[PDB]
Amino acid sequence: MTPLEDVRTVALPRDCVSTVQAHLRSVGQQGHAGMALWVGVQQDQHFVIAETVIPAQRHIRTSDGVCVMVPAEELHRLNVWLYKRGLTLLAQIHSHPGRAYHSTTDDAYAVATTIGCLSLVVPNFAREPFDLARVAAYRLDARANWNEVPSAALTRMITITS
Amino acid sequence: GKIEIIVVVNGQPTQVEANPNQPLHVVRTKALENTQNVAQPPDNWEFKDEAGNLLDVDKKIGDFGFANTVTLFLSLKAGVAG
Ligand SMILES: [Zn+2]
C-alpha cells in the first residue's frame, strides 16, 4: 500500500472547509483556539478528503497565549472510528489569535502523527474566509520535523472541489 | 508460543509477531515504525483493548494470556496545539 508520505495531490470538498472554518470561527469569537481534522482515502499519490472531524477538545490559557487539548479518550475514539470507517487521517487544522505559524507546542504534540501528514494554522481566530494562501502549513517528514509547505506549494497540492 | 498482535494506529492495522517473554512496549515500538507514526515518540502512546482497558506496557506479553491473535489499539496520551 502506498504510504501517506507519497501523497502529492489532495481533493478538499468545499463543505469540509466550511465545517472547519465554522468551528474555528465559533470558538474564536470566545477568544479560543480550535482544532479540526481532515480524514479520507488515499489512491496512489492522490488523497480524497471525505470528512471533517471536530474532536472533543478543551481550551486552556497558557503563560503567553492559548491552546487546545484533545483528551486521551477522544484520541482513542478517533483511532477506533478511523478503523471502523476505513478512513485515514491526513491533516490537523488549528487557529491562532494572531499570526499563523507552528509553535514549539505545535511541533511537539500533534494529533496527525504519520509521516506525510499536514498541519495547517489559521490566523486571527479564523475571522477571515478560509484561504489556502492565508494559512501557515507544515508537513511531517521522516525525521519527525514539521517543515513549512509554503503557500505556492500548498495551493498546488490542495484543490478545493464542489 | 508467539502471539499475533494486530495493532491499530490512527485507524491503520499492522501485524506484529510478539514473543511471550517480551514486554508489550516492544510491540509499541514496532507498530509505530510499521505505520510511520513519528510525530510523538513511543513514550507518548498507550494501548487499549477492545473494551477500553488500558494495558500495562511493561508487562510481558505472555502474562496477558492472549489468544493466538488479538487486536490492540495504540493511541496518543495527549494532543495539543496552539
Ligand atoms: Zn499553533
mmCIF file of C-alpha atoms in Angstrom, chain B:
data_model
loop_
_atom_site.group_PDB
_atom_site.id
_atom_site.type_symbol
_atom_site.label_atom_id
_atom_site.label_comp_id
_atom_site.label_asym_id
_atom_site.label_seq_id
_atom_site.Cartn_x
_atom_site.Cartn_y
_atom_site.Cartn_z
ATOM 1 C CA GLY B 1 4.073 -19.612 21.671
ATOM 2 C CA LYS B 2 4.165 -16.407 19.617
ATOM 3 C CA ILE B 3 1.137 -14.089 19.685
ATOM 4 C CA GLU B 4 -0.004 -12.308 16.528
ATOM 5 C CA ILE B 5 -0.997 -8.802 17.633
ATOM 6 C CA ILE B 6 -2.882 -6.617 15.188
ATOM 7 C CA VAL B 7 -2.006 -3.116 16.392
ATOM 8 C CA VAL B 8 -4.227 -0.318 15.113
ATOM 9 C CA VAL B 9 -2.685 3.179 14.955
ATOM 10 C CA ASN B 10 -4.774 6.094 13.620
ATOM 11 C CA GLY B 11 -7.094 3.504 12.131
ATOM 12 C CA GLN B 12 -4.299 1.610 10.341
ATOM 13 C CA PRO B 13 -3.621 -2.028 11.316
ATOM 14 C CA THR B 14 -0.218 -3.648 11.425
ATOM 15 C CA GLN B 15 0.507 -7.254 12.387
ATOM 16 C CA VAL B 16 3.302 -7.646 14.963
ATOM 17 C CA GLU B 17 4.525 -11.093 15.982
ATOM 18 C CA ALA B 18 5.144 -10.950 19.729
ATOM 19 C CA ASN B 19 7.323 -13.157 21.883
ATOM 20 C CA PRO B 20 5.773 -14.121 25.249
ATOM 21 C CA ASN B 21 8.926 -13.119 27.132
ATOM 22 C CA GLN B 22 8.911 -9.583 25.594
ATOM 23 C CA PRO B 23 7.225 -6.601 27.277
ATOM 24 C CA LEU B 24 4.372 -5.006 25.436
ATOM 25 C CA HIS B 25 6.443 -1.855 24.831
ATOM 26 C CA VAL B 26 8.478 -3.825 22.271
ATOM 27 C CA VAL B 27 5.261 -4.174 20.251
ATOM 28 C CA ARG B 28 4.524 -0.454 20.640
ATOM 29 C CA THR B 29 7.848 0.492 19.056
ATOM 30 C CA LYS B 30 7.411 -1.898 16.120
ATOM 31 C CA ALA B 31 3.835 -0.825 15.453
ATOM 32 C CA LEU B 32 4.733 2.859 15.345
ATOM 33 C CA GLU B 33 7.625 2.127 12.960
ATOM 34 C CA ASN B 34 5.447 -0.020 10.702
ATOM 35 C CA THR B 35 2.716 2.625 10.469
ATOM 36 C CA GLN B 36 5.173 5.562 10.135
ATOM 37 C CA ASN B 37 3.771 7.390 13.158
ATOM 38 C CA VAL B 38 6.665 9.552 14.328
ATOM 39 C CA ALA B 39 5.286 12.953 15.383
ATOM 40 C CA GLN B 40 5.262 11.916 19.046
ATOM 41 C CA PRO B 41 7.769 9.392 20.462
ATOM 42 C CA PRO B 42 6.723 5.912 21.654
ATOM 43 C CA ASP B 43 6.592 7.108 25.258
ATOM 44 C CA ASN B 44 3.534 9.201 24.300
ATOM 45 C CA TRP B 45 1.247 6.351 23.169
ATOM 46 C CA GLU B 46 -0.752 3.811 25.144
ATOM 47 C CA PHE B 47 -2.512 0.529 24.414
ATOM 48 C CA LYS B 48 -6.187 -0.165 24.943
ATOM 49 C CA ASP B 49 -8.065 -3.379 24.287
ATOM 50 C CA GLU B 50 -11.432 -3.625 22.545
ATOM 51 C CA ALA B 51 -13.179 -2.804 25.889
ATOM 52 C CA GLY B 52 -11.141 0.346 26.569
ATOM 53 C CA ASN B 53 -8.940 -1.223 29.249
ATOM 54 C CA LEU B 54 -5.511 0.393 29.424
ATOM 55 C CA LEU B 55 -2.738 -2.213 29.246
ATOM 56 C CA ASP B 56 0.493 -2.117 31.259
ATOM 57 C CA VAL B 57 3.197 -1.645 28.611
ATOM 58 C CA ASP B 58 5.899 -3.033 30.928
ATOM 59 C CA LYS B 59 4.106 -6.368 31.354
ATOM 60 C CA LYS B 60 5.464 -9.351 29.455
ATOM 61 C CA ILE B 61 3.196 -10.400 26.595
ATOM 62 C CA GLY B 62 2.887 -13.927 27.987
ATOM 63 C CA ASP B 63 1.469 -12.617 31.252
ATOM 64 C CA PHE B 64 -1.649 -11.314 29.462
ATOM 65 C CA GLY B 65 -2.700 -14.830 28.423
ATOM 66 C CA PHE B 66 -3.707 -13.661 24.950
ATOM 67 C CA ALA B 67 -5.449 -15.718 22.309
ATOM 68 C CA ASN B 68 -3.273 -16.651 19.334
ATOM 69 C CA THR B 69 -4.415 -13.464 17.561
ATOM 70 C CA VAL B 70 -5.550 -10.300 19.348
ATOM 71 C CA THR B 71 -6.263 -6.707 18.313
ATOM 72 C CA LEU B 72 -4.971 -3.767 20.344
ATOM 73 C CA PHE B 73 -5.440 -0.046 19.785
ATOM 74 C CA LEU B 74 -2.398 2.184 20.169
ATOM 75 C CA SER B 75 -3.444 5.788 20.743
ATOM 76 C CA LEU B 76 -1.955 9.083 21.892
ATOM 77 C CA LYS B 77 -1.950 10.105 25.533
ATOM 78 C CA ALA B 78 -2.361 13.762 24.587
ATOM 79 C CA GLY B 79 -2.784 16.014 21.571
ATOM 80 C CA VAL B 80 -2.146 19.752 21.895
ATOM 81 C CA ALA B 81 -1.955 22.723 19.561
ATOM 82 C CA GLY B 82 -1.745 26.479 19.968
#
